Scaffold this active site. Structure first.
Site, PDB file in Angstrom:
ATOM      1  N   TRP A 125       0.808  -1.211   0.000  1.00 48.77           N
ATOM      2  CA  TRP A 125       0.000   0.000   0.000  1.00 48.77           C
ATOM      3  C   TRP A 125       0.842   1.262   0.000  1.00 48.77           C
ATOM      4  O   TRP A 125       0.401   2.287  -0.515  1.00 48.77           O
ATOM      5  CB  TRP A 125      -1.063   0.046   1.119  1.00 48.77           C
ATOM      6  N   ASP A 260       6.942 -14.015  -2.578  1.00 44.90           N
ATOM      7  CA  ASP A 260       5.653 -13.396  -2.379  1.00 44.90           C
ATOM      8  C   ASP A 260       4.655 -13.971  -3.377  1.00 44.90           C
ATOM      9  O   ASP A 260       4.926 -13.941  -4.570  1.00 44.90           O
ATOM     10  CB  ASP A 260       5.789 -11.859  -2.520  1.00 44.90           C
ATOM     11  N   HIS A 289       6.589 -11.363   1.069  1.00 47.14           N
ATOM     12  CA  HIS A 289       5.959 -10.073   0.831  1.00 47.14           C
ATOM     13  C   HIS A 289       6.575  -8.903   1.601  1.00 47.14           C
ATOM     14  O   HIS A 289       6.707  -7.812   1.040  1.00 47.14           O
ATOM     15  CB  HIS A 289       4.468 -10.184   1.261  1.00 47.14           C
TER      16      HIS A 289
END
EC number: 3.8.1.5
Length: 310
Positions: A125, A260, A289
């Site tokens: 994000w 990931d 990740h």
């Protein structure tokens, strides 16, 4: 005006490897009465500023291994916690969190602190949002450190940025299920699952900001926004593609967490082609990740790459 709650300070008494003093701002334009926390480390009068943005469902604690490397290099490092995370205030209703709400906070922060000569450090994000910042004021951005992230564009413009939502079943599908469904969401347990090398103390630092589900509205909304992109998000992200491809002239360093299942190589190679001048990526075979968990290496290599052109 936004109904919000604040995590009691005692929840952070015992953090592991987090000796950074808090800085807070509560006078941000458009965010009346909300206090945002951020780290400001290294020489405050440095020419270079590393702006470190976290993702879901983390906080500035995520950059703890990278902070010291960048600071020792002579730069100032800014690592803010988004509203709903870390030490920042947390709006209680999921409807208050939107792409623009978080994006506008960042532009406000940047103006408020008058940051320039920025080296943008993003992931997840932090990158979905951070990658759309430069086009708003290109003069303040000079370098980019990109780890597993992409742009929240529509499926037709960039299928790679949408395909992961649906496949594989143990990728984003599992991720979202783990976050939005539980009525008793334990973040330390979630982090241990998704970042298997964390020690127990580290995992607990991820649960520290949330005493109970009432503090988790921002946590619950992030995954939903990946699945349901609003028009403003789409339009903004689509225009950012053009920025990176044709406007960007800064230095770039890319690192990929190879294990990931979400934003790995099939998302990163495509991103690499869109960033003008992006070099060969640093593939970290054992990183998942949360690339930052193997951050020292990333910080060191990026600095090495940048010096080698400055």
């Amino acid at each position: 005006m936004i109904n919000a709650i604040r995590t009691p300070d005692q929840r952070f008494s015992n953090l592991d490897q987090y000796p950074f003093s808090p800085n807070y701002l509560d006078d941000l334009p458009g965010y009346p009465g909300l206090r945002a926390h951020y780290l400001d480390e290294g020489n405050s009068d440095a020419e270079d500023v590393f702006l470190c943005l976290h993702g879901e469902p983390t906080w500035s604690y995520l950059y703890r291994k990278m902070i010291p490397v960048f600071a020792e290099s002579g730069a100032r490092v800014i690592a803010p916690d988004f509203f709903g995370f870390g030490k920042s205030d947390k709006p209680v209703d999921e409807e208050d969190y939107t792409f623009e709400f978080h994006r506008n906070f960042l532009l406000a922060l940047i103006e408020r602190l008058d940051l320039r000569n920025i080296t943008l450090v993003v992931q997840d994000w932090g990158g979905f949002l951070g990658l759309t910042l430069p086009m708003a004021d290109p003069s303040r951005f000079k370098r980019l450190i990109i780890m597993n992230a992409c742009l929240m564009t529509d499926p037709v413009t960039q299928p790679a940025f949408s395909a992961f939502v649906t496949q594989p079943a143990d990728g984003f599908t599992a991720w979202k299920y783990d976050l939005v469904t539980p009525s008793d969401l334990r973040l330390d347990q979630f982090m241990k699952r998704w970042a298997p090398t964390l020690t127990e103390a580290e995992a607990s630092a991820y649960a520290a900001p949330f005493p109970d589900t009432s503090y988790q509205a921002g946590v619950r909304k992030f995954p939903k926004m990946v699945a349901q992109r609003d028009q403003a998000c789409i339009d903004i992200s689509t225009e950012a593609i053009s920025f990176w491809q044709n406007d960007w002239n800064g230095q770039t360093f890319m690192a990929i967490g190879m294990k990931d299942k979400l934003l790995g190589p099939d998302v990163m190679y495509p991103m690499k082609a869109l960033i003008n001048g992006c070099p060969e990526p640093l593939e970290i075979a054992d990183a998942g990740h949360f690339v930052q968990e193997f951050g020292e290496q990333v910080a060191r290599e990026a600095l090495k790459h940048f010096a080698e052109t400055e």
